[PDB]
Structures are given as structure tokens and as C-alpha cells.
Amino acid sequence: MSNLVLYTLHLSPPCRAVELTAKALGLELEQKTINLLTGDHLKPEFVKLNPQHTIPVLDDNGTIITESHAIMIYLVTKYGKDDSLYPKDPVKQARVNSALHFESGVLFARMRFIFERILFFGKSDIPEDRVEYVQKSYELLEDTLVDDFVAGPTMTIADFSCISTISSIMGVVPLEQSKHPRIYAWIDRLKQLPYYEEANGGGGTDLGKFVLAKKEENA
Amino acid sequence: SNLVLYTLHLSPPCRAVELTAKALGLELEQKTINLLTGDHLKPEFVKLNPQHTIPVLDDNGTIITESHAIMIYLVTKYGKDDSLYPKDPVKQARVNSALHFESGVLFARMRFIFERILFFGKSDIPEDRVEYVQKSYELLEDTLVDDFVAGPTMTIADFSCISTISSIMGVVPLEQSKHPRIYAWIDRLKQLPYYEEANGGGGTDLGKFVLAKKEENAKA
Numbered sequence: 528m529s530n531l532v533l534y535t536l537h538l539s540p541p542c543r544a545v546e547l548t549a550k551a552l553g554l555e556l557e558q559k560t561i562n563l564l565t566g567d568h569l570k571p572e573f574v575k576l577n578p579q580h581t582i583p584v585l586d587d588n589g590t591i592i593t594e595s596h597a598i599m600i601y602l603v604t605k606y607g608k609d610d611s612l613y614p615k616d617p618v619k620q621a622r623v624n625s626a627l628h629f630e631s632g633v634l635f636a637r638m639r640f641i642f643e644r645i646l647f648f649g650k651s652d653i654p655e656d657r658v659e660y661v662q663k664s665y666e667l668l669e670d671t672l673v674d675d676f677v678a679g680p681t682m683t684i685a686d687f688s689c690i691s692t693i694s695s696i697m698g699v700v701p702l703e704q705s706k707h708p709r710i711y712a713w714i715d716r717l718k719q720l721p722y723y724e725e726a727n728g729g730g731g732t733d734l735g736k737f738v739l740a741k742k743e744e745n746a
Numbered sequence: 747s748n749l750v751l752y753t754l755h756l757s758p759p760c761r762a763v764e765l766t767a768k769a770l771g772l773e774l775e776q777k778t779i780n781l782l783t784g785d786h787l788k789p790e791f792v793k794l795n796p797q798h799t800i801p802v803l804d805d806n807g808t809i810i811t812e813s814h815a816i817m818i819y820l821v822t823k824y825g826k827d828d829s830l831y832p833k834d835p836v837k838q839a840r841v842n843s844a845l846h847f848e849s850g851v852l853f854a855r856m857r858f859i860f861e862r863i864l865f866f867g868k869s870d871i872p873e874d875r876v877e878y879v880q881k882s883y884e885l886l887e888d889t890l891v892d893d894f895v896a897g898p899t900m901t902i903a904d905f906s907c908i909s910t911i912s913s914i915m916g917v918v919p920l921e922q923s924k925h926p927r928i929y930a931w932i933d934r935l936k937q938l939p940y941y942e943e944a945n946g947g948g949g950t951d952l953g954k955f956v957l958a959k960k961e962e963n964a965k966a
């Protein structure tokens with residue numbers, strides 16, 4: 528059939544989670560750039576694909592899938608050769624599902640509460656409370672990492688959500704190494720992947736850099 | 747033997763679980779975790795959930811944290827059919843997408859509003875917080891193309907959404923004339939014979955309690 532299509536932007540953290548998932552699955556993704564910065568997500572063809580007007584959005588031969596965590600689950604279920612990235616055991620799957628919602632309701636939400644007002648609303652500060660909210664999220668991630676990976680002894684799509692966000696926010700709200708030895712060790716694991724820098728590492732670094740740059744530019 | 751829920755009825759994600767349990771005909775044994783007295787910060791609770799949030803499910807020794815994971819787990823283990831959580835990958839992707847919209851958008855913005863009031867002695871709701879919330883309503887309204895959030899059928903994504911929306915509309919006004927789809931979706935849900943007991947009273951009461959805490963904090 529047709530190559531999977533991702534409506535996407537490499538700077539976007541949930542887009543990078545899907546790109547790591549694809550690489551892990553040995554899937555090739557056709558990327559169509561939706562540039563948020565020149566407003567492409569609000570242009571009206573894109574709004575028909577996604578009424579929430581967010582990226583990523585998946586086009587699988589006419590089946591449209593919105594939302595990074597739904598996209599990654601969809602890809603593993605349909606294109607996985609096993610369920611190592613997304614367990615089929617109800618209990619180990621619950622540990623993954625709980626970690627995905629941690630990423631969306633805590634890690635990504637708090638990051639967005641910090642980045643969006645700068646990238647999109649023209650602000651030039653990061654308030655004391657935002658810093659504390661984010662740093663609290665780092666601490667929750669540290670406490671969750673009782674195992675090598677976020678949702679157990681094995682790497683799952685919940686690791687990809689988590690690192691796509693953490694690698695972006697770390698260079699704005701500092702993640703100090705000694706308060707956070709478990710996160711540090713975990714980053715190291717994921718960096719061992721052959722596709723890590725390419726599918727996430729650098730896009731994360733660059734998003735952090737870009738927010739600081741646009742913030743001096745807003746002050 | 748008893749499925750146990752570590753819970754507080756005012757908490758939206760606890761009520762989402764309560765709705766799901768009713769929809770499946772399950773009976774939950776509820777154990778109070780009083781967040782207002784820091785029950786969740788105690789070592790006994792942190793052992794159950796290192797993120798120290800409610801709800802936590804205890805299924806005969808098996809510990810399942812996080813409302814959305816718990817609802818899935820429960821439908822997976824106890825559902826007689828798949829209508830509340832589909833097996834079909836595409837249909838299921840539309841529910842999973844609404845669940846992450848509830849956690850990442852509806853709940854996270856409601857908590858960005860409530861938490862500072864209930865725990866940090868704040869008397870205000872900053873302007874931007876109100877704007878985040880109003881924007882969450884508009885996104886939900888645009889999502890409701892069908893009768894329910896993830897299609898023509900009611901799913902666990904409806905329980906998660908209403909538990910929250912029923913709590914925040916008490917505090918940040920959800921204007922009827924601008925959100926007629928949300929109002930019609932609410933009326934569908936309140937038809938459920940277990941709606942009031944499982945959700946309606948708690949949602950209303952959390953709204954009230956936030957409004958009362960806010961006034962209290964503005965005195966002293």
C-alpha cells in the first residue's frame with residue numbers, strides 16, 4: 528500500500544516520540560512538515576485532519592490517527608512483530624499505560640505551560656512557579672524509574688514519550704545530575720540506541736535552545 | 747475477593763473509575779486517601795505509587811495506578827463486551843486519543859487552576875489559567891462531531907472527560923450558547939442511572955469546595 532505519512536515537525540517532542548517508535552519498528556515514515564511557527568497547523572486543510580489542530584497526525588492509507596501516544600500504540604499493534612514496545616499482558620500494559628498518561632498529563636503539560644507562552648504568546652520570562660512545577664515533574668520521573676526503563680526492565684514506547692519531552696525541557700529548566708542519578712543513567716541507556724541522536728537527541732537540544740533564543744528576543 | 751480503590755470522591759480521576767466500575771457492574775471497596783491532610787504523602791501510600799496520586803487500584807494484591815490505565819485494565823479483565831474500550835485498532839486509537847486529550851489537556855489545565863487554591867493558599871485564578879481552560883472547552887466542543895467524544899458509542903473516554911468537565915465548569919464558566927455540543931453530550935451522560943451517585947455530586951462538590959477555599963484564602 529502507501530508509505531505511512533506523518534504530519535510533523537522535528538522540533539516537536541511528541542513528533543520525535545513517533546519517529547523513535549517508527550525506527551524501533553523498522554518502519555519508514557513519509558514526513559510532511561507542519562511548521563507551527565508559520566502557522567501551518569491552523570491552515571484549513573490541516574484542521575479537517577485534526578480539529579484539535581495539534582501535531583503529530585498519522586495518515587495510514589486513508590486511516591487518520593491523531594495524538595502521539597495513540598499513534599505509537601497503533602503502530603506497534605498493527606506493525607509490531609512482537610509486543611516488546613507495547614506489552615499485551617493486561618498488568619504490564621497497565622504499567623505502560625500509566626507511564627504514557629504521566630508523560631501527557633505531567634511531563635509534556637508542564638513543559639508546554641512553560642514553552643507555549645514564550646513561543647506563541649510572546650512572553651520573555653519563566654515565572655518561579657513554572658520552574659517549580661517542572662522541577663517537581665523531574666523528581667516524579669526519578670521516583671518512577673525504580674527499574675532501568677520508565678515502565679519496567681525493558682524499553683517501551685513510554686520511554687520514547689518521556690525522553691522526547693525531557694530532552695527538550697532539560698536545557699531550559701535545568702535537570703541537575705546529582706539530584707537526578709536515575710534519569711541520567713536512563714538517558715545513557717537510550718543514547719545507546721543507533722537511531723537516538725537522529726530521531727530525537729538533537730531535535731530536543733535545538734527546541735530547548737530555540738525557546739531561550741525566542742525568549743531573549745521577546746524581552 | 748474485593749477490588750479496592752484508593753480514592754477521594756471529590757477527585758475527578760477517582761470518579762472516572764467509579765463510573766467505569768458502575769458501567770461494568772463491578773463493586774468497589776473504597777479506601778479514603780485524604781489529600782487535604784496529606785494522606786498521599788505518607789510512606790504507606792508512596793509505597794503504592796511513587797508519583798503519590800489517586801486513584802490507585804488494588805486488585806487482590808495487584809496494584810494498578812493512574813485512572814486511564816485502571817479503566818482499561820478493568821474493561822480488559824471484567825468487560826463482557828468491548829463497547830467501553832474497543833479491541834479494533836482504529837476504533838481503539840480514537841479512544842486512546844481522547845484519553846490523552848483528557849489527561850494532557852482537560853485535567854492538566856483544571857489542576858493548573860485548582861492546585862494552587864486547594865494546597866498553596868492562593869486566592870486568585872490568574873487570567874492565563876482561565877484562558878487555558880476556556881481553550882480546553884473549545885477543543886472539546888470541536889472534538890464532539892459524534893454523540894460521544896470518541897465516536898457514536900459511549901466509551902471510557904466519556905467517563906474521564908465528564909468527571910473533569912463536571913468539576914471545572916463550577917469554577918471557570920462553560921457558556922452554554924458557545925458550547926452546545928458539550929451541553930448535549932452532558933445531557934446524554936446524565937441519563938445513565940448511576941450518573942448522580944458515581945459522578946454528579948462529587949463534580950459539583952469539588953467546584954463548590956474550590957470556590958469556598960478561594961474565598962477562605964482571600965481573608966487569611
Ligand SMILES: CCCCCCSC[C@H](NC(=O)CC[C@H]([NH3+])C(=O)O)C(=O)NCC(=O)O
Pocket residue numbers: 538539540541563564568579580581582583593594595596631639642646734846847850
Ligand atoms: C517548535 C515547537 C514545537 C511545539 C512544542 C509542543 S508540541 C506541538 C503541539 N502538540 C501537542 O500539543 C500534542 C499533544 C498530544 N498529547 C500528542 O501527544 O500528540 C501542537 O501541535 N500545538 C499546536 C496547537 O495546539 O495549536
Ligand SMILES: CCCCCCSC[C@H](NC(=O)CC[C@H]([NH3+])C(=O)O)C(=O)NCC(=O)O
Pocket residue numbers: 628629632754756757758759781782786797798799800801811812813814849857860864952
Ligand atoms: C480535594 C480534591 C481535589 C483533587 C483534585 C486533583 S485529583 C487528585 C490528584 N490526582 C492526580 O493528579 C491523578 C491524575 C492522573 N493522571 C490520573 O488520572 O490518575 C492527586 O492525587 N494529587 C496529589 C499529588 O500530586 O500530590
